[PDB]
Amino acid sequence: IERILEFTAKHEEWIVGENVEDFTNENIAMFLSRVSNTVSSKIPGYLGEKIDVNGLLSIKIEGSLEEKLKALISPKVSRQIGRLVMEDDKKLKKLLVEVAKAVLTREILKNELPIEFPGGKIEGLKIQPRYEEDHINFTARYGSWIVVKRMIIDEKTPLLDIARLLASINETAVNKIKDFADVDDKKIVEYFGGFKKVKKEEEIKEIVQLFREFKGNEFEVRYAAREMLSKLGLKVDVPSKNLEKYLE
């Protein structure tokens, strides 16, 4: 297909649309940033068949950033999350717990760290929806890069499948922003290389400080935050593969 970069969504009262028409790296990165923020914000509303999301987002994580991080990796919170997952199968429950944990981690930390990308969320209809029926549509073609992640939404569409698609779209956005913004992600990985499986309060303090000292622009810091969190086993992007494996 020819050059295109668009996102539209139409489901119940959620109707939004945005595209790029002036194809600069800045505009592409800002579009993908907004897509990431938008789809990530909507994922929890599609997890209700398997996760008690109201209960999940009602979990209290108190204190400074360092204290919140310690809480998020704690056995207590893992047990709290497990209790909110409606699954009996040990293997499948583990997959859903990790998804729930990623949702909680994003919501707890987004005002403490640069978790969301710049630019906020898509709230209006810059373009009209590409399809008349309810749908999710992410379509990208630029140079050799092509991604088509879309589906029609029926009354028989599993909500968890919409969650999966939204998570997959988020993954594309996160993967590609660092290409369009020329983020040296290898350097970021090596920057945090002195830490592994961070559990102790003292080490959490150290890694947060190292993150704060990271010199980078608005895009680079989002990846530094993600890398720092990865050392604690924390994620802020829902792993679509977990939902894929459940739905199989």
Side-chain angles (χ1 to χ4, degrees):
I1 58 171
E2 296 305 324
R3 179 178 290 178
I4 190 170
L5 190 49
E6 64 169 46
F7 175 76
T8 67
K10 176 176 173 284
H11 189 221
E12 311 286 319
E13 282 183 296
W14 180 40
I15 309 160
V16 299
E18 195 157 293
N19 70 338
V20 175
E21 288 173 30
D22 191 356
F23 288 85
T24 62
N25 288 329
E26 187 192 25
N27 290 344
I28 296 168
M30 289 303 292
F31 168 81
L32 293 171
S33 289
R34 288 167 55 76
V35 168
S36 169
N37 295 341
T38 305
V39 303
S40 293
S41 78
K42 291 292 183 183
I43 286 164
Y46 289 100
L47 295 173
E49 298 156 337
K50 300 306 301 188
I51 299 162
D52 181 353
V53 177
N54 290 123
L56 179 66
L57 302 177
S58 295
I59 294 172
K60 297 275 80 60
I61 308 288
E62 292 277 348
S64 63
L65 175 60
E66 293 85 351
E67 290 181 304
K68 290 181 173 175
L69 294 175
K70 184 81 177 298
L72 285 164
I73 65 166
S74 74
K76 171 180 162 65
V77 166
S78 185
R79 185 158 40 257
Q80 287 182 262
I81 296 168
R83 284 173 169 161
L84 297 159
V85 172
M86 293 86 82
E87 182 55 57
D88 306 325
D89 185 275
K90 180 175 174 170
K91 210 149 272 85
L92 296 177
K93 187 177 182 173
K94 190 178 179 186
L95 294 171
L96 294 166
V97 166
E98 193 181 10
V99 169
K101 192 181 167 181
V103 165
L104 182 62
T105 300
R106 173 175 287 254
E107 294 310 298
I108 295 301
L109 301 179
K110 64 178 193 184
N111 297 316
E112 302 264 341
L113 288 165
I115 299 308
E116 293 185 306
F117 288 85
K121 301 178 292 287
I122 306 167
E123 298 285 353
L125 279 163
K126 179 184 188 286
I127 55 168
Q128 67 164 127
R130 184 52 69 97
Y131 303 93
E132 293 190 57
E133 41 273 306
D134 281 1
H135 70 277
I136 310 294
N137 165 42
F138 181 90
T139 297
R141 197 274 166 161
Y142 191 69
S144 60
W145 176 59
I146 180 156
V147 170
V148 173
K149 288 177 177 185
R150 62 195 177 203
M151 69 183 166
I152 305 308
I153 299 169
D154 281 339
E155 298 72 42
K156 309 293 100 187
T157 307
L159 257 36
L160 206 76
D161 196 36
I162 303 168
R164 190 200 47 79
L165 190 65
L166 292 171
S168 190
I169 289 164
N170 183 238
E171 285 161 346
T172 289
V174 175
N175 177 52
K176 294 301 295 177
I177 288 162
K178 36 172 188 66
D179 292 335
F180 289 103
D182 287 350
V183 170
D184 190 349
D185 57 321
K186 177 182 154 294
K187 209 76 149 280
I188 291 169
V189 168
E190 289 174 25
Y191 184 82
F192 289 100
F195 296 88
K196 185 175 186 174
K197 268 76 181 294
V198 176
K199 290 160 85 178
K200 300 179 270 82
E201 277 180 349
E202 52 263 37
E203 199 164 33
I204 293 171
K205 192 181 295 176
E206 288 158 6
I207 202 178
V208 169
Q209 184 65 28
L210 187 62
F211 160 81
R212 295 200 193 279
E213 293 161 357
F214 174 82
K215 299 102 171 84
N217 65 32
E218 65 189 323
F219 296 103
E220 292 166 328
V221 300
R222 269 74 189 176
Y223 293 95
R226 283 162 166 78
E227 185 62 19
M228 180 273 284
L229 293 170
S230 83
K231 300 306 186 196
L232 281 72
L234 294 172
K235 294 174 170 186
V236 290
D237 302 313
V238 170
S240 71
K241 69 177 192 173
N242 291 36
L243 298 170
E244 191 180 333
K245 185 64 191 179
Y246 175 89
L247 292 166
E248 285 179 63

